[PDB]
Symmetry: C2
Subunit: 33 residues, 2 copies
């Protein structure tokens, strides 16, 4: 029944926040205010 254990999926969303913040942070730093 869906295995009710989406561990990997949860791993991807975590990576999602890290993705947006990683590239967004990169441009932010380069922009320098």
């Amino acid at each position: 029944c869906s295995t009710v254990s989406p561990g990997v999926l949860a791993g991807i969303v975590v990576g999602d926040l890290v993705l947006t913040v990683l590239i967004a942070l990169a441009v932010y730093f380069l922009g320098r205010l």
Copy 2:
């Protein structure tokens, strides 16, 4: 078994790809300084 519903999770991975190409397209096109 339970509700859980790992559907939204799948939706997030899709969003992950969107983030990669979105920011990547932004910086590649013309990273504002």
